[model samples]
Target: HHHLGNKLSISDLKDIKNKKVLVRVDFNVPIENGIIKDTNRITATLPTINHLKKEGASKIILISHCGRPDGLRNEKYTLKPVAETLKGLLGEEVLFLNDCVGKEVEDKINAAKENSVILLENLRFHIEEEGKGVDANGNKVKANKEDVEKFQNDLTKLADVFINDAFGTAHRAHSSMVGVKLNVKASGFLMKKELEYFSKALENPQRPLLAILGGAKVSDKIQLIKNLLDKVDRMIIGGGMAYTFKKVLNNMKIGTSLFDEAGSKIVGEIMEKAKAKNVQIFLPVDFKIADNFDNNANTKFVTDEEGIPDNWMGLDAGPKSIENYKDVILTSKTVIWNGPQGVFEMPNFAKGSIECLNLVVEVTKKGAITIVGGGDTASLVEQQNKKNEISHVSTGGGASLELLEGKELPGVLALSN
Candidate 1:
């Protein structure tokens, strides 16, 4: 029973006093050597958790999966460390359960006091989390259709209402995100805000909408480019993907620059379509070439982005191209950027991406609606300490891209129903 336009929201639940609220949050933060590398993902969920507490929720069961433990209790991928990290963030003792299922966990939930939060173990330790049957070795196996029913039943039993705040994993139709939504469901504050920003950019936008696309492969962004052709007034292309577009030009010598011939053909067709739609597509005019594909490789310039020597490869956009892109970004009333213009992780090839960020921030300050659509672009903005400068920085790369592709997310659709 899905009812169109009948989706409930956290705000809709007026009498949530003492109600057990099960929240599916994306606590899949980056951890290294038993420490959380970044707490931005954890910090993003504060508003929702605080709201649930403020609304007098009896017990807030926070369920999330860290890394892929693959249906086995792997100590290396446990959420125990995250529980400690979050405890510090919330200034209280967060109850940590070793397993996400069965009676022992349910008993603790039954005893939890109002406004208390319980962090469950990694959900992927169970095969049913992903709606699959597995063997003793944790490999996937074919099983009866009823295999996932137990997992789904155990989940809905623990809560009076379900709130999905994990926008990062909303594209996935996992049991926690989709199956549990069959019960009383609502969107948390974080989920609502993400959708609202996406709708502002895609559903209705300021005039002269611009989107900047880059990254490693043309194949990855094919659908996104095709989908945005209907909405964006201008599109900027760069990164290793630009090599494929460079190969489209007549007599363009790509050298050993990680060229994908098949992808070049696809980009050629995309270019033709963009031309037909009268959407201005910008490709690099010049590039920073490297002798080898390495962080510390010897580098040079291809002032004319047309031809490259047989020994060199393109690594970053040249100085002229940066100025060219800045001009277009400044005049756009709405701008959404995903991916990076170059190998931004390395110091030598980071100039192009950094310059683009500076211009985007400038436009945002000038009152343009600037959005960082996650992935490397989101990290880049965060790394530059300019996350506050952008109008919105998305939490999920794939989820944002799926939204940009005009696809309805399963988790979102589930709640809507």
Candidate 2:
């Protein structure tokens, strides 16, 4: 789990007064009308920034991304509003650099005095920064190898130590996430907390560690199910993906639900692994079938095996599945939920997800270490205004999953590599 450079922590860098600390944070918040609609992601990294300020670290060079631009400049994806948001939160102006790297940005960075914070332009501006283009010799570029090595060397000149608190983007092995860490590595408060919690859950979970897996795509969570075989006490599969498992189990015709025929072999393998390992795999027994994909489509709950007609497809988990899952949620001492149980965005099929959320929140209130991983599940929690009620809602999906699976992330690996 350790890598090449010193994995300095908050304590290690706390005394570096008057030093420019280049902090890589995740500022990818939900934006509306050129202003940040949600500051959850920005506020998440505040502890680290505040600590650096308290420690009298000279200047704070904050680097982050707004959205995916494929290494190209996009005005709509600017970090201007983000700077203002930071100013609002910190009660001080966060100076903005026109670009993340190069001379103009460097000038603005130096202009800011000691203890002053400056938000850099989008890092994905450069083609090389986004893991792109050719070297001087015209060789093809790659991630986390020679290309990454060169990129890290270039970024090291900006600050004294690399403080990575961007757990949302921690799963990536990109230049900022992985490459920069290989040069100068340190974990901010959020990153360290992420490792600590995930380690406890995966390495020494309490009895009856229940894992709830949902989402529209089966392919997305396939690896997660296989990884949780010997780890989780019970696995609940719901959302559109569960229809495939239910159909496979009973040879029922799934009309138009998201099903991956190519994953048939792997699905069977997962079931066998679960059986052999005594991992209880809970699939949906019934579903809300509909003739069309739209929100206003005629819907009916199909309970029997033969109830799903030829032209109708299952969209969300039926009442039977919710009731079954509720029982599992209530009895568990620890729970990890990754996705929604149904089409949560649509009002018609939001009941199962809402019911599941209600059960988990209630369980969490009763003392279970309830953790919700990734964006969708976190979004669901926020929608219900129960984010504060849950024990912990992880900001990083891929990072959290990798930690649960006991795999060292490339970004985390890059630091200690």
Candidate 3:
């Protein structure tokens, strides 16, 4: 779907024998006391690594960044522990270098065994990676242009080809993301699936592409709503953002409901555009109202006709909204859900989010192309033990959001030309 740059996927490569490939993957997993808490990111990268190995890549150089070290070489941000996890998962020995780039890196990798998988240190350990960092005095400092270029060139020269699998960081225009230049720069399997699925949902789909939009503020999802209206057959505007719509259009009283004064200004325009495009917009007809912002708060279900009263805020969608969502979600051939319908963190208000997840999973079983957007929704899926139930859960949060907002990612664009 040229929805992205029409960039080549890793499978496009015809020659892989004896080539040294540099791979940028999102191994930025959570680490506590040198122990990696999650292995999903690393495991997701297996197909690309095994593919290269199967195709006879002599060397696979993996690079990634962890917690923001602010371009300082901190021991806490090292990638050594990830190498251990990879070794176990890949069932192969991994040679981990302490630094990402240097003559040392080249010497070690070239001398390693054939089909060697080497993980370099965190790329953000240097100022040139991000092009900016905080100095020892804790003030902001920018890397010199020449140094940044040199850093990029140094990393680029080490590999015969480049493979970017880091869709999680695709939105970031950092050095490691776009700096590596090679004739055969390609997208890894993870990035390919992310783009392909998003494109499938947005550009070329079965039919009745329904968009489920939820979140705290209308301002945050304004552009997302605008872009989806141009394509989706129907949309569900729920969460705190819906109150702004109900207040603006239905003249309903939203008592202390999360409202965006700035986003309120464009609610009419969004509705008019949706009608102009013949797209049906659905807002929650009822909600789980709470008297206080806590798990133990007194909560009750209320409908649009009743209206939320003062001192009470709508925290979750009521049964009416869930029933309506189930119908809309089930009928659609393609569905894209971003954000959540309720205060996700509070146990008492998780009714809507949990129920909606079940509905989407049910639709998925019916062969609908259900693509769940990344960020909070992805985390919700993971927490609910339903990660594999959906068609695809995007790995990149900000990247997915930017793509939905109709924007190009520099990391994806860099591979085009």
The prediction achieving the highest lDDT against the true structure is 3
C-alpha lDDT of all candidate models, in order = 0.83, 0.77, 0.89
Clashing pairs in 3: none
TM-score of 3: 0.94
The C-alpha local distance difference test score for the whole of candidate 2 amounts to 0.77
Q: Can you tell me which runs of candidate 2 are displaced by over 4 Å?
A: 1-8, 11-13, 30-33, 102-111, 133-151, 181-184, 253-258, 291-299, 401-407, 414-417
TM-score ranking, best first: 3, 1, 2
Question: How well does candidate 2 match the true structure in TM-score terms?
Answer: 0.85
Best by TM-score: 3
Q: What digit string (tens of lDDT, one per residue) describes model 1 on residues 307-352?
A: 7888899889998899898779999999989979999998999999
Q: Rank the candidates by lDDT, best first.
A: 3, 1, 2
Question: Compared with the true structure, what per-residue lDDT tens digits does model 2 show for residues 185-239?
Answer: 7778888777555655666777588889888777766778888887888989888
Q: lDDT score, residue 139, model 1? A: 68
Ranking 2 against 3 by lDDT, winner = 3
